[PDB]
Amino acid sequence: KQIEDKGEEILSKLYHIENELARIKKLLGE
Amino acid sequence: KQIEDKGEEILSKLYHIENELARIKKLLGE
Amino acid sequence: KQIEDKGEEILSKLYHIENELARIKKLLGE
Amino acid sequence: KQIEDKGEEILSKLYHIENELARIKKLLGE
Q: Return the exposure string of B20-30: e unless at least 16 CB atoms fall within 10 Å of the residue's CB, then b.
A: bbebbeeeeee
Calpha distance C1→C24 (Å, rounded):
35
Q: Which amino acid is at B23?
A: R
Partner residue facing A9 (CB), from C11, C25, C28: C11
- Alpha-carbon torsion (C4, C10, C14, C19), positive or negative: positive
Please give the method by which this entry was determined. X-ray
Chain B residues within an 8 Å CB radius of D14: 14
Chain B residues within an 8 Å CB radius of A10: 6, 10
**Is residue C20 packed enough to be buried (19+ CB in 10 Å), middle (13-18) or exposed (0-12)?**
middle
- Residue B20 to residues A7, A20, C3, C21: CA-CA distances in angstroms? 22, 10, 28, 13
Instruction: Give SS3 for B28.
Output: coil
* Contact predicate A14/C14, CB 8 Å: yes
Residue of chain B whose Cα is closest to the Cα of D10: B11
Residue numbers of the domain that contains B11: 1-30
DSSP code per residue over D11-28: HHHHHHHHHHHHHHHHHH
* Contact predicate C28/D25, CB 8 Å: no
Q: Which amino acid is at C15?
A: Y
Q: Which amino acid is at D5?
A: D
Q: Which of A27, B29, B4 is nearest to C26 (CA)?
A: A27
Q: Which amino acid is at A11?
A: L
Q: Resolution, in Å, please?
A: 1.9
- Residue D8 to residues A7, A27, D12: CA-CA distances in angstroms? 14, 33, 6
Instruction: Identify from C5, C15, C17 which residue to disrupt to test chain A contact, counting A C-beta atoms within 10 A and taking the largest count.
Output: C17
Tally the domains of chain A.
1
Chain B residues within an 8 Å CB radius of A28: 24, 27-28
* Contact predicate D8/B9, CB 8 Å: no
**Is residue D10 packed enough to be buried (19+ CB in 10 Å), middle (13-18) or exposed (0-12)?**
buried
Q: Which of A17, D20, A5 is nearest to C7 (CA)?
A: A5
Q: Cβ of D29: how many Cβ atoms within 10 Å?
A: 9
